[PDB]
Homo-oligomer: A and B are copies of this chain.
Amino acid sequence: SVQTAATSWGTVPSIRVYTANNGKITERCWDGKGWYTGAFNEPGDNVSVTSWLVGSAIHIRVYASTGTTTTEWCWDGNGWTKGAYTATN
């Protein structure tokens, strides 16, 4: 079965759900008006997520793992970038 991770923010709310399937992670999004597939699409067998607000601006961190490597992906308003996280050291 596929594996999911979810986060949400505000009172509308906005929700993001990430799904790992066959080595790829896809993103589904709700901002009050319907579900749509988001811009996040990266490799991974496993996913987790967290998010926080700075005022009205959302910041999202998605942790995508394959083997023993976890890659952090970052949303800070400007598309998906890679983060400084590593699993060790």
How many residues of chain A get a CB closer than 8 Å to chain B's CBs? 47
Which of B8, B21, B66 has a CB less than 8 Å from the CB of A50?
A: B8
Which of B8, B61, B67 has a CB less than 8 Å from the CB of A8?
A: B61
Count of this chain's copies in the oligomeric assembly: 3
- Residues of B near A35 (CB, < 8 A) are 84-86
Whether A59 is near chain B, meaning CB under 8 Å from some CB there, is: yes
Which of B4, B13, B87 has a CB less than 8 Å from the CB of A52?
A: B13
User: What 19 additional pairs, Cβ within 8 angstroms, besides A34-B84, A37-B88?
Assistant: A2-B65, A2-B87, A3-B46, A4-B47, A4-B63, A4-B70, A6-B50, A6-B63, A8-B50, A13-B52, A15-B50, A15-B61, A17-B48, A17-B63, A17-B85, A21-B68, A28-B85, A28-B86, A28-B87
